[PDB]
Design an enzyme around this catalytic site. Structure first.
Site, PDB file in Angstrom:
ATOM      1  N   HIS A   1      29.551 -23.936 -30.723  1.00  0.00           N
ATOM      2  CA  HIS A   1      28.972 -22.270 -31.210  1.00  0.00           C
ATOM      3  C   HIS A   1      30.274 -22.152 -32.431  1.00  0.00           C
ATOM      4  O   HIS A   1      30.835 -21.260 -32.498  1.00  0.00           O
ATOM      5  CB  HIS A   1      28.315 -21.611 -31.117  1.00  0.00           C
TER       6      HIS A   1
ATOM      7  N   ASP B   1      25.653 -17.190 -36.063  1.00  0.00           N
ATOM      8  CA  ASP B   1      26.587 -17.567 -35.037  1.00  0.00           C
ATOM      9  C   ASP B   1      28.292 -17.101 -34.337  1.00  0.00           C
ATOM     10  O   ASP B   1      28.908 -17.088 -34.275  1.00  0.00           O
ATOM     11  CB  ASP B   1      26.739 -18.517 -34.369  1.00  0.00           C
TER      12      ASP B   1
ATOM     13  N   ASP C   1      18.251 -23.721 -36.407  1.00  0.00           N
ATOM     14  CA  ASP C   1      19.734 -24.260 -35.129  1.00  0.00           C
ATOM     15  C   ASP C   1      19.215 -24.606 -33.839  1.00  0.00           C
ATOM     16  O   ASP C   1      20.484 -24.855 -34.077  1.00  0.00           O
ATOM     17  CB  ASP C   1      18.988 -22.224 -34.281  1.00  0.00           C
TER      18      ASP C   1
ATOM     19  N   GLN D   1      17.257 -32.722 -21.544  1.00  0.00           N
ATOM     20  CA  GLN D   1      16.242 -33.506 -22.866  1.00  0.00           C
ATOM     21  C   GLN D   1      15.174 -33.381 -23.023  1.00  0.00           C
ATOM     22  O   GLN D   1      14.446 -32.806 -23.614  1.00  0.00           O
ATOM     23  CB  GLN D   1      16.978 -33.939 -23.388  1.00  0.00           C
TER      24      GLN D   1
HETATM   25  C1  8Q7 Z   1      24.836 -24.318 -25.449  1.00  0.00           C
HETATM   26  O1  8Q7 Z   1      24.648 -22.950 -26.234  1.00  0.00           O
HETATM   27  C2  8Q7 Z   1      23.212 -23.891 -26.378  1.00  0.00           C
HETATM   28  C3  8Q7 Z   1      22.545 -22.517 -26.303  1.00  0.00           C
HETATM   29  C4  8Q7 Z   1      21.283 -22.756 -27.422  1.00  0.00           C
HETATM   30  C5  8Q7 Z   1      20.826 -25.092 -28.583  1.00  0.00           C
HETATM   31  C6  8Q7 Z   1      19.182 -24.590 -29.389  1.00  0.00           C
HETATM   32  N1  8Q7 Z   1      19.489 -25.817 -28.551  1.00  0.00           N
HETATM   33  C7  8Q7 Z   1      20.138 -26.773 -29.156  1.00  0.00           C
HETATM   34  O2  8Q7 Z   1      20.486 -26.758 -30.157  1.00  0.00           O
HETATM   35  N2  8Q7 Z   1      19.510 -28.001 -28.198  1.00  0.00           N
HETATM   36  N3  8Q7 Z   1      19.827 -29.448 -29.231  1.00  0.00           N
HETATM   37  C8  8Q7 Z   1      19.537 -30.312 -28.063  1.00  0.00           C
HETATM   38  N4  8Q7 Z   1      19.187 -29.903 -27.141  1.00  0.00           N
HETATM   39  C9  8Q7 Z   1      19.622 -28.531 -27.534  1.00  0.00           C
HETATM   40  C10 8Q7 Z   1      19.199 -27.273 -26.263  1.00  0.00           C
HETATM   41  C11 8Q7 Z   1      19.021 -27.416 -24.646  1.00  0.00           C
HETATM   42  C12 8Q7 Z   1      19.144 -25.608 -24.642  1.00  0.00           C
HETATM   43  S1  8Q7 Z   1      19.297 -24.319 -25.889  1.00  0.00           S
HETATM   44  C13 8Q7 Z   1      19.359 -26.262 -27.118  1.00  0.00           C
HETATM   45  C14 8Q7 Z   1      18.690 -25.462 -23.100  1.00  0.00           C
HETATM   46  N5  8Q7 Z   1      18.713 -26.592 -22.664  1.00  0.00           N
HETATM   47  C15 8Q7 Z   1      20.172 -26.144 -21.482  1.00  0.00           C
HETATM   48  O3  8Q7 Z   1      20.008 -27.650 -20.563  1.00  0.00           O
HETATM   49  C16 8Q7 Z   1      20.313 -25.353 -20.552  1.00  0.00           C
HETATM   50  C17 8Q7 Z   1      21.764 -24.941 -20.438  1.00  0.00           C
HETATM   51  C18 8Q7 Z   1      19.790 -24.718 -19.793  1.00  0.00           C
HETATM   52  F1  8Q7 Z   1      19.112 -25.629 -18.707  1.00  0.00           F
HETATM   53  F2  8Q7 Z   1      20.409 -23.280 -20.346  1.00  0.00           F
HETATM   54  C19 8Q7 Z   1      17.748 -27.631 -22.894  1.00  0.00           C
HETATM   55  C20 8Q7 Z   1      19.103 -28.641 -24.608  1.00  0.00           C
HETATM   56  C21 8Q7 Z   1      22.455 -25.062 -27.611  1.00  0.00           C
HETATM   57  C22 8Q7 Z   1      23.566 -24.342 -27.038  1.00  0.00           C
HETATM   58 MG    MG Z   2      23.140 -18.509 -31.380  1.00  0.00          MG
HETATM   59 ZN    ZN Z   3      22.776 -21.570 -33.327  1.00  0.00          ZN
END
Ligand code: 8Q7
Ligand code: MG
Ligand code: ZN
EC number: 3.1.4.17
Length: 323
Positions: free
Chosen positions: A80, A119, A229, A281
């Site tokens: 971020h 952000d 985003d 993923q």
């Molecule tokens: C690091 O902080 C963030 C917050 C939000 C984002 C938005 N986001 C995103 O752009 N992408 N792009 C590819 N994958 C993700 C993805 C995933 C998310 S949010 C998100 C939740 N998730 C997890 O693994 C999280 C840990 C958990 F289980 F809560 C599955 C993958 C990105 C980063």
């Molecule tokens: Mg944000």
């Molecule tokens: Zn963002």
């Protein structure tokens, strides 16, 4: 103030930037990766504002001060950070360029600025962490914790001397654009996306969606904010892979703190469970990203290359899970 200020050197250097002509054609494409052009990111934002809103939409001195102070108020966190802000703003540029007259001049200048700012001052922690461990930010902002802070940082930066790029709007338009920005930044709280997308899905599927209905309009802008985003899932697979590394660097660092505080994190924030990330993923693409770009493409057909690229990266993740 709470916001840091740029130096004269930094904003004066920006004013004389000119984008190389080869990057003019590339910057229009959805899949564009700003990655290898770090020194140019501020100038790339200036260019994008000038193509979308026109060359005299903002006063150049105020715009460069604003941009360089926004840069300075992003922290050096794994994901971020300033790079993410320009990446999200570029996706919005591409969306708007392809949907140009559906949105007002005020909305385009608002949404580009909101994306660059969305952000601001991120600490590398989720809303969940802040409310769980009673961070002071969470005492201040009960819901959508970081996003309220980001918008508050946007206003702080506008309030810096010579920074207020919106001060030449009418009193009414000034108040409208700050509202456009506030809602747009709040909409980047992914917790809100799931309800927003189901509402949009139902409005679209019943033929009731109406872009001149302001409540419908806010929801469409919110889905655009989500689509911007999340846009790393719409890049080419090597870019998507590299960005995933930054995302999970930040997640794992949060999980390390949770462990120190005697609370086991979810697997996706646990670096000792890296093996589960490919499956996580797949679940994220299936439950979040794909529906987001699918609903966005239904409302805004020109945004289909985002969905196409997102399906392509879903297939790559499916290949990881296999071979
Ligand atoms: C690091 O902080 C963030 C917050 C939000 C984002 C938005 N986001 C995103 O752009 N992408 N792009 C590819 N994958 C993700 C993805 C995933 C998310 S949010 C998100 C939740 N998730 C997890 O693994 C999280 C840990 C958990 F289980 F809560 C599955 C993958 C990105 C980063
Ligand atoms: Mg944000
Ligand atoms: Zn963002």
């Amino acid at each position: 103030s709470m916001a840091s200020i740029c130096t004269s050197e930094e904003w004066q250097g920006l004013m004389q930037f000119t984008l190389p002509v080869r990057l003019c054609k590339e910057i229009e494409l959805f899949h564009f990766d700003i990655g290898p052009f770090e020194n140019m990111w501020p100038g790339i934002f200036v260019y994008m504002v000038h193509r979308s809103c026109g060359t005299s939409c903002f006063e150049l001195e105020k715009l460069c001060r604003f941009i360089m102070s926004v840069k300075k108020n992003y922290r050096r966190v794994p994901y971020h950070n300033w790079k993410h802000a320009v990446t999200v703003a570029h996706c919005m540029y591409a969306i708007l360029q392809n949907n140009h007259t559906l949105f007002t001049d005020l909305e385009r200048k608002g949404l580009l600025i909101a994306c660059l700012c969305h952000d601001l001052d991120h600490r590398g922690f989720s809303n969940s962490y802040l409310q769980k461990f009673d961070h002071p930010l969470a005492a201040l902002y009960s819901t959508s914790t970081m996003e309220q802070h980001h918008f508050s940082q946007t206003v702080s930066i506008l309030q810096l001397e010579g920074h207020n790029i919106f001060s030449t709007l009418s009193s009414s338009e000034y108040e409208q654009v700050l509202e456009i920005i506030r809602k747009a930044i709040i909409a980047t709280d992914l917790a809100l996306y799931f309800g927003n997308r189901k509402q949009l899905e139902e409005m679209y599927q019943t033929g009731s969606l109406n872009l001149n209905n302001q409540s419908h309009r806010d929801r469409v802008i919110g889905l655009m904010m989500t689509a911007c985003d999340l846009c790393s899932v719409t890049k080419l697979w090597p870019v998507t892979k590299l960005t995933a590394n930054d995302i999970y660097a930040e997640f794992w660092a949060e999980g390390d703190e949770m462990k120190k505080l005697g609370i086991q994190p979810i697997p996706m924030m646990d670096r000792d469970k890296k093996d589960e990330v490919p499956q996580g993923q797949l679940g994220f693409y299936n439950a979040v990203a794909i529906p987001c770009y699918t609903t966005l493409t239904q409302i805004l057909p020109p945004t289909e290359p985002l969905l196409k690229a997102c399906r392509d990266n879903l297939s790559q993740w499916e290949k990881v899970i296999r071979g």
